[PDB]
Amino acid sequence: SISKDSRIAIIGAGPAGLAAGMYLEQAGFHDYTILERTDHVGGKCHSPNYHGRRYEMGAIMGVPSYDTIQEIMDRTGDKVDGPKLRREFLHEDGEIYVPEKDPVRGPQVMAAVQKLGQLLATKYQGYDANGHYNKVHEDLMLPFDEFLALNGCEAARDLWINPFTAFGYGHFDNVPAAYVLKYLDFVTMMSFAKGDLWTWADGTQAMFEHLNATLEHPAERNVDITRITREDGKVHIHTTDWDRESDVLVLTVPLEKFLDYSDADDDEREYFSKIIHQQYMVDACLVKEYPTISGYVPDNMRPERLGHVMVYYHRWADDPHQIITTYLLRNHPDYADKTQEECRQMVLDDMETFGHPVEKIIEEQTWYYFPHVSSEDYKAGWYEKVEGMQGRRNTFYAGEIMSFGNFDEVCHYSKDLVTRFFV
């Protein structure tokens, strides 16, 4: 349905663009170019060095059902070889609790998980399809808490929240269920609860660096795109060092930001302007009284505690002078954004409360994170519209907004974009 000779420009060398290149290439499309703005590849899979080891500034983990990432590893020769994840739960005062052994709440949560599992198996069949082009059940378009409440499954949120809100994906009072359950589908949720999780000694970034290297055309880096225009059935890309024509455009970069350097048509401007995102802040810390295990703080995942540390990552157990990363959110639709400065102070105060006082913050990053749309915009058919635009003036839309903000979902989506439109 697209000719193998086509000149394909892929924008972004994160997992989504690297995966697009991989699957295009494996389908016989040999004339692609990946254009990356930064010096590096892997995007939010970002694994810097410190004292001879890599720590994670972005993505850390996967699950055994990450079949597309397995396919990437098969190609690169990478293996799941990182340290085992373990965790404890803390209250906002730093006291350790065991929600699994709460004899009142515990059964109520697991009862609701049971009930939800059966709904997902029957009534909501299809919910877990990659992407949103297969229109989900209307109930899944509601905020996750409303969806649960409609089904009498509210207590399930106690399980689902920990790998969601603390992972920067926002809050169940407003995030549509369709996103929550495509990421944490039942089998995935069960893997998280069991601790059956993948990590990489050399960082999530490594396998993407290795993927890039296996490509017939590794990414061009430090490419500053000033304008894209799409006349006469072609794509013209202007950069600070060259300007070139392509036949096809694949976008794995933020679509609202794309409006600012493109000849965005009426629909693009209208719809991509509706995209909202998360401000997810990570601090790479050196600490005293080194933790012995990672910690989750459900109390700090409430919208009323916005900006507090929700989780910290104990990566290298053997070395107390290694990096502990902390995670917090700076935005919520119903509260004013928290400033970088007040959040940083909460890093210091919370880690102190938890008994792991910060000696040094060596790196901090607020990521552009989990692009999505509101329940109202989802219900109003945002994905029917945008997916209906696929191919218009030879432009295809992919990346996080089109699926979910995790590395397996975006790579899966890229794989399928090829099947759907190209082959």
Ligand X SMILES: Cc1cc2nc3c(=O)[nH]c(=O)nc-3n(C[C@H](O)[C@H](O)[C@H](O)COP(=O)(O)OP(=O)(O)OC[C@H]3O[C@@H](n4cnc5c(N)ncnc54)[C@H](O)[C@@H]3O)c2cc1C
CB of 199 to ligand X, least distance (A): 9
Q: Is 329 in the site for ligand X (CB under 6 A)?
A: no
Tokens 């601090």, residue? 283
Instruction: Say how many C-beta atoms besides its own lie within 10 A of residue 359's C-beta.
Output: 11
Strand-by-strand arrangement of the 294-296 sheet:
96-97, 87-90, 294-296, 311-314, 324-329, 276-287, 358-372
> Over the range 314-338, which residues count as b (16 or more CB within 10 Å of their CB) and which as e?
bbbeeeeebbbbbbbbbbbeeeeeb
Which of ligand X, Na ion, none binds 100 (CB below 5-8 Å, type-dependent)? Na ion
CB of 106 to Na ion, least distance (A): 7
Query: Is residue 39 near Na ion by the rule CB under 5 A?
Result: yes
Instruction: Please pick, from the candidates 78, 268, 377, 408, the single residue that binds ligand X as defined by CB under 6 A.
Output: 408
Choices 14-22, 105-113, 146-154, 265-273; region in contact with ligand X by CB under 6 A: 14-22
Residue span 275-294 as binding mask against ligand X, x where in contact by CB under 6 A, dash where not: -----x-x------------
Nearer to Na ion, 40 or 236 (CB): 40
Q: In whole angstroms, what separates CA 295 from the centre of its chain?
A: 20
Whose structure tokens read 């919910």?
A: 127
Q: Give residues with Cβ within 8 angstroms of 149, minimum separation 6.
A: none
User: Coil, helix or strand for 276?
Assistant: strand
Helix (H, G, I), strand (E, B) or coil at 141: helix
Spatial distance between the Cα atoms of 323 and 320, rounded to a whole number of angstroms: 8
Nearest distance from C-beta of residue 149 to ligand X, angstroms: 28
Distance in Å, CB of 380 to ligand X, minimum: 24
Q: Does 234 bind Na ion (CB under 5 A)?
A: no
Binding mask 84-113 for Na ion (x = CB under 5 A): ----------------x-------------
Identify residues 98-127 at the interface with ligand X (CB under 6 A): none
CB of 57 to ligand X, least distance (A): 7
Nearest distance, CB of residue 215 and Na ion, angstroms: 19
Q: What are the residues whose beta carbons fall under 8 Å from the beta carbon of 285, sequence distance 6 or more?
A: 323, 324, 325, 326, 347, 351, 358, 359, 360, 361, 362
The CA distance from 315 to 92, in Å, is 22
Site size toward ligand X (CB under 6 A) is 35
Name which of residues 192 to 251 contact ligand X (CB under 6 A). Answer: 223, 225
By CB under 6 A, what part of segment 176-195 binds ligand X?
A: none
**Residue where the block lists tokens 């490419």:** 223
Handedness of CA 411, 189, 175, 313 (dihedral sign): negative
Under rule CB under 6 A, residue 253 binds ligand X? yes
Segment contacting ligand X by CB under 6 A, of 42-50, 82-90, 101-109, 303-311: 42-50
Would you state the torsion angle of the CA atoms of residues 254, 260, 264, 270, taken in this order, to the nearest 10 degrees?
Answer: 70
CB nearer ligand X, residue 45 or residue 343: 45
- The answer to whether 312 and 322 are in contact (CB under 8 A) is no
Stretch that binds ligand X, among 59-67, 153-161, 241-249, 271-279 (CB under 6 A): 59-67
Report the distance separating Cα 228 and Cα 226, nearest Å. Answer: 7
Segment interacting with ligand X (CB under 6 A) among 9-17, 87-95, 96-104, 306-314:
9-17
Q: Which of 90, 140, 399, 422 binds ligand X (CB under 6 A)?
A: 399
66 neighbors 199 (Cβ within 8 angstroms): no
406 near ligand X, rule: CB under 6 A? yes
Torsion angle, alpha carbons of 15, 17, 23, 24, to 10: -170
Instruction: Using the rule CB under 6 A, give the single segment among 40-48, 79-87, 101-109, 311-319 that binds ligand X.
Output: 40-48
Q: Is 309 helix (H, G, I), strand (E, B) or coil?
A: coil
Binding site for Na ion (CB under 5 A): 39-40, 100
Binding site for ligand X (CB under 6 A): 11-17, 35-38, 43-45, 58-62, 167, 223, 225, 252-253, 280, 282, 367, 369, 399-400, 405-408, 410
